[PDB]
Curated annotation (Swiss-Prot), chain B:
Domain of life: Bacteria
Lineage, highest ranks first: Bacteria, Bacillati, Actinomycetota, Actinomycetes, Mycobacteriales
Domain observations: The sigma-70 factor domain-2 mediates sequence-specific interaction with the -10 element in promoter DNA, and plays an important role in melting the double-stranded DNA and the formation of the transcription bubble. The sigma-70 factor domain-2 mediates interaction with the RNA polymerase subunits RpoB and RpoC. The sigma-70 factor domain-4 contains a helix-turn-helix (H-T-H) motif that mediates interaction with the -35 element in promoter DNA. The domain also mediates interaction with the RNA polymerase subunit RpoA.
Native source organism of the sequence: Mycobacterium tuberculosis (strain ATCC 25618 / H37Rv)
Note: Was identified as a high-confidence drug target.
DNA-binding region(s), chain positions: 137-156
Region (Sigma-70 factor domain-4) location: 111-164
Subcellular location: Cytoplasm
Protein name (record): RNA polymerase sigma factor SigA
Its biological purpose: Sigma factors are initiation factors that promote the attachment of RNA polymerase to specific initiation sites and are then released. This sigma factor is the primary sigma factor during exponential growth.
Induction context: Constitutively expressed under all conditions tested except for 3-fold reduction in stationary phase, standing culture and upon growth in H(2)O. 2-fold induced by starvation. Half-life of over 40 minutes.
Gene responsible for this protein: sigA
UniProtKB/Swiss-Prot annotation, chain C:
Disulfide bond residue pairs: none
Gene Ontology molecular function, alphabetical: DNA binding; DNA-directed RNA polymerase activity; ribonucleoside binding
Effect of residue 407 to P: In strain: vr2; rifampicin-resistant
Entry similarity comment: Belongs to the RNA polymerase beta chain family.
CDD domains: RNA_pol_B_RPB2
Name of the top EC class for this enzyme: transferase
Name of the molecule in the record: DNA-directed RNA polymerase subunit beta
Description of how the protein assembles with itself and partners: The RNAP catalytic core consists of 2 alpha, 1 beta, 1 beta' and 1 omega subunit. When a sigma factor is associated with the core the holoenzyme is formed, which can initiate transcription. Interacts with CarD, TRCF (Mfd) and RbpA.
Function statement: DNA-dependent RNA polymerase catalyzes the transcription of DNA into RNA using the four ribonucleoside triphosphates as substrates.
GO biological process terms, semicolon-separated: DNA-templated transcription; response to antibiotic
Swiss-Prot record, chain D:
Oligomer and partners: The RNAP catalytic core consists of 2 alpha, 1 beta, 1 beta' and 1 omega subunit. When a sigma factor is associated with the core the holoenzyme is formed, which can initiate transcription.
This protein's name: DNA-directed RNA polymerase subunit beta'
Role this protein plays: DNA-dependent RNA polymerase catalyzes the transcription of DNA into RNA using the four ribonucleoside triphosphates as substrates.
Induction trigger: 6-fold repressed by starvation.
Annotated positions binding Zn(2+) 1: 60, 62, 75, 78
Family listed: Belongs to the RNA polymerase beta' chain family.
Amino acid sequence: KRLKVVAAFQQSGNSPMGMVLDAVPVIPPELRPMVQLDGGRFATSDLNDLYRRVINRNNRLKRLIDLGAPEIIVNNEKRMLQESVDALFDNGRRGRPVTGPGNRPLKSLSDLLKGKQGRFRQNLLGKRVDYSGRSVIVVGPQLKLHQCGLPKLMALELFKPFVMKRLVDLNHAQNIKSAKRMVERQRPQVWDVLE
Amino acid sequence: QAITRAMADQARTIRIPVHMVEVINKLGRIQRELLQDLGREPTPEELAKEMDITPEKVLEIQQYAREPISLDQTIGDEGDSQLGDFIEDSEAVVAVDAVSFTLLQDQLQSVLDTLSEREAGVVRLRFGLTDGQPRTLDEIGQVYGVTRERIRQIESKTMSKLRHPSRSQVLRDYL
Amino acid sequence: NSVPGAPNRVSFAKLREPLEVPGLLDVQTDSFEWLIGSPRWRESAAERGDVNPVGGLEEVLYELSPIEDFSGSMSLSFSDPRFDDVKAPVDECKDKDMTYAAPLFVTAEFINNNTGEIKSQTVFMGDFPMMTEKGTFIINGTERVVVSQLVRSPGVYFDETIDKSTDKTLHSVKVIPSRGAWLEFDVDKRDTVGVRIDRKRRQPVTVLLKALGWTSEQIVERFGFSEIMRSTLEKDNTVGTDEALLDIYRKLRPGEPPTKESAQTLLENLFFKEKRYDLARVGRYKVNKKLGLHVGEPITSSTLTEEDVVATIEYLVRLHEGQTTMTVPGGVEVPVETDDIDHFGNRRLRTVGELIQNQIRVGMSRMERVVRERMTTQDVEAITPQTLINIRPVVAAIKEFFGTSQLSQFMDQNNPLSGLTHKRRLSALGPGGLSRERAGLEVRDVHPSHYGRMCPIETPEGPNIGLIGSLSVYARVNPFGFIETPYRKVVDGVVSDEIVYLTADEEDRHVVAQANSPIDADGRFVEPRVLVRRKAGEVEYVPSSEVDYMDVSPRQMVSVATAMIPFLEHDDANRALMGANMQRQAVPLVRSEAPLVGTGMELRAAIDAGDVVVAEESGVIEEVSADYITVMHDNGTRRTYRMRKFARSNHGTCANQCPIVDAGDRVEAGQVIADGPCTDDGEMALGKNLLVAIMPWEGHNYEDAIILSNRLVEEDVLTSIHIEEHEIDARDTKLGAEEITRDIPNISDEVLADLDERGIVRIGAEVRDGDILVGKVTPKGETELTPEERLLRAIFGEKAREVRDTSLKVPHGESGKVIGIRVFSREDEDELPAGVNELVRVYVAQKRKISDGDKLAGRHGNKGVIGKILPVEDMPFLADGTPVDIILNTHGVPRRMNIGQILETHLGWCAHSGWKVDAAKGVPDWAARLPDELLEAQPNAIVSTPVFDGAQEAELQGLLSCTLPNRDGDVLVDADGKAMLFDGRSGEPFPYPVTVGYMYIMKLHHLVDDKIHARSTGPYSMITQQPLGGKAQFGGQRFGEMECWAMQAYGAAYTLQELLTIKSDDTVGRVKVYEAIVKGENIPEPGIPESFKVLLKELQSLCLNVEVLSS
Amino acid sequence: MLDVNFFDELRIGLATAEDIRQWSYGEVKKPETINYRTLKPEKDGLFCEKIFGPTRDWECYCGKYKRVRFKGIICERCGVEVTRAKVRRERMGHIELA
Ligand SMILES: [Zn+2]
């Protein structure tokens, strides 16, 4: 079991120094957005809170080291730094999870890549797609096997650019903006080109 | 002192200076002390009377003290989705107005090419279309060997011919 | 009957009910009465436990007081919880969005034991929300309803387990008290015992009994017969009380050196102190009953005691010996058996009183902490209770409970039955409950104790199946939290009228009889063997003389939503379940015709739902109008009931109230005055009576599909008024102020015709999807003014229009007329939220007709969408020429096992056409047991059928035999129910007769208008560029990995890549594709998804060097 | 590495501190996110524009350059490299641990 990792660290040209960590990266801000909602309320991805905790602990440890403090306080600060990086990389893996407001575990980096709600099986494997709709089904016994019914409004919404071009070409609308206005108003000429 | 200072400038996701976190704390304490003595929520005008300051500032500080919320807390009564799934990305390109802008640029190029080339270049560099910067008249004179009054006159000719309904109707529609 | 305005509902019921159904809202009103301690509840306990009449608030205050300091020379106490009048009546608090609440007052006694002074200060506790007559709270205008919760009652629970190694039996216990540390006593795999204290797996009983001041002689005297515990005590290996105390300290508080006194006080503070271990008043009595400790003593000292521990030891060890009865020294004898955790004698019911009590208890705990902090920091005699008190945590706790809590949820009100069933509903999820993931298969099952207490049919079909249910119709909540049902007691085969109430545990020691037994009016069952329910839920035969109880009535095991299903006993449990669930989600039509065939529960359900006007005091009617009714009471004074017209329900339905009285009639107290949304003459009416043919017609009614005639569309038989509200607020901003004004930039005039100069739509004006509603203009600030914009304004002379027109517009896919506009603003001196200064809300209503895709269903489990609405010509019609209205398939009813609705169809046809039984030469054999006044029935006569005692097959067949015609001489249906009918398409008669008759159908709240959605290019999310989801947002269907499997299996690669990259994610791909399709150009090559780049950056941020190599 | 959907292999390995500081475009050293009043990000904060690029397209902190013609030039005042605005999704930060 030990050789399983020792041989990997041997034959591969990577130093095991990477096991311990002394310089922690910071995700791009747009991946941890801070956005003002309608009403002045602000939202954050809980990553800003963990990064703030890391920054606070690191700065306080710097102050303790530079000032000169008894080794108990320095050890406590180093332990807090270790636990803060712990919470950042994987919250709740060790000890009780770091909790914010509302008494809920915070979403660390690991929790953003795990399970159904993780990125892998929620955004990468299957995505919400455009040019799609959904509606109730009704038996179509008069249809042919290769045919299927479609609501007029749903068909209009789906084929919006298609009818846009096909009607601005037939001079019903002078420009694309007029075509959009006709489509949104649902002018009678729209239905013929839609069909 | 150390604990209060740290809680002031370190305990907030949106950091607030101590000089006015002080007045948030005092506003809260006075409002909750007067609420029990009066029996009702203290109107911000009365709170301002206790402040010896304008009420509008009281509403401003009240809306400043509000802390941010979490994007990932489950929003429903049943746990199925997070808040961040329901926030629209404003910075994203509309993908409809882009094609509209391109076709508007095409229409502008056609209209300008319909006009005389000197006028087209004059207005193009006057409003900085082909380059990043619009230019003043003296630049137009230095690039066309004319006085600035002549450029004013040709600009007058440009928007005079541009008021022609042939262009006016074909371009005004694009809005 | 017994209702002053009850319509004449003839009934097929054989036996009579000794008691009427109680007010089905009594589990919400009575619990709140206990909470407050109203005089009604005060006298209620006067003959039901007057030994200690105390309310919930009184109990909490008494438990809290007295609170003192570390010195004990100064303290504070609370008493006299007095309420006050409500701030505003219900409707105005529903209007301007304020909580229906009243101030709370209590008296505080400040004592100073050092010298002695008194300070009785009447402190304002806060603003306590109140419960309305309907049993619903109002929070911020919205109407919220709290539901009771099912939890394990704190106490003692022995259980049995098989080791599955040598088949040795093992017995474990879990004394699970609320707010305390668990104790798990059991017999281990080997002979000794395990005494797990707070999850620490060491130290058998030897150290515990020794730690209680005993030694080896006590444990050897108490236990000489139990060789297991004898072996254990021999394996003590420890001598010394202090040694046992320190050994406990090892596995109870490690990390701190022990001392001689620390462990001794630690044990008391952990178990025998009522601050860290207090099984509630329910728990102490449960323990006493389980162990026979105290049988005639008042309830006090909620903390667990030592004799309780020794009795637990004795009970467990005797259970391991297989003993039957244990007699504790100093108590009565108790039989020894394992305790079931799902038996309703061990599952309590936390009603609204208990939940609000717990939240108030948390608030008072915070209160005690803060007052304990403050009473010392201030000098004596300079301190007053007002400054000792800071009521903020109490109101914070009540606001925390009422909002953003999943046990007090938004009222489900789209018809009276949904409101009735939302309250009086038993839930199991929430704080202290079990989640659906935490829920096993055993809990979801129906326990034999569910009978009469909780309905076994009414439960949602989704993931929450079995977790949440509904209360029975006769069920009662004991003042103790346990559930309880009434039952008549039979003595020596004599049935008494005396009604006594039994809980789940009291039923085992008795034998209850069958609900519908052959009673001879003398109390004696004609046969000795009678269907009875035994102790363990077993059903068996038994002679009559030894039974001692009987059901009060049939339909006692069933709820109120399922008691409205006619011919229930002829239906499968699953279909009855779904029918009961669809009864909850019918829509209020515009006429609400009463059903021909139903059950007597409809009248009571409509009456006590609270939404039908009931004359509180008898008297003549002074005057009647649509808006109001003025009724003159006998004692001179009058009363005006203000009718509520066209009010939007929580689900956007109609709630009109039409009076059904005249200007000169006399009304008695309790008679229905006006009808609600889904009521006719004060009785429930959730649908319409439609003629039904059960033939499969040309495939348009294939696979549960249902076809309708155009008469329903033309006659407005099934049409619903739907109302929506659109809030919009103008608020202060650093840019300035947003104005509700008509100065809207770059808008035409034909769309400005229907706005007032105030800037909002004229009342009574038609709008549709995309039309502007309120003109709200915001300062745009600044941006990059395009040069092209400058040339644009230079061509027409258009102003810069310095403001942004983010006005409110009708969202996609709705229309209708506007009903009302409500506007609030700061200069109107209103209580607007801090930040907003105008807020206008507009009500738009449309008369939604019935179309394809709308779901229609019966109350027997049959459902289906409208396959087509074909004209009146193409409908099979009888020889009289009346076209059928609704046609359903025949291939669903026999397979799905819902034959009850066919019987309902036949009974409905009999009730519609009318009947008379020829009583010339005596009554026929089938009608001998049929009651009088049921042998004659005029056309369109309403009937009734109790769910489990209704019309039998023979009676219905006889009724079908004689079905006298209405106007002409034409017996359309034959004796067997089927009838000839003429095709409307080809014209020739159908070869064989088919069943026809009147069926009660209802329109469900799953209309296709609110269910159709489509998008081409909407908005996108922030982190990943995937489009959002839902109907409020523009949406976009989720193409999950399961569909990715199908597309990969098809071998279609280009389609999959299209659906992934450009159609969803690749931003440049999206815009380029849109440009290409608009320009009529070829769609370009898909790019790289943005979510993959997001994942790469995320993985990089996790200290993982991930680089993609070209070569 | 140019992201043209021409890939032959994807590799993952332990990241040393030299790589972590190589990815970063600066060292975030202040726990400051957004100015409570100006509604702007701060210097060396978690949202610093100098480290992570400009929030608005083609503008520095004080708006010295608000024009397209400035491409790829890092301003001398705040060091915000005037460029396109989605670099906030691409660039990266790092913290030097005590
Ligand atoms: Zn700058």
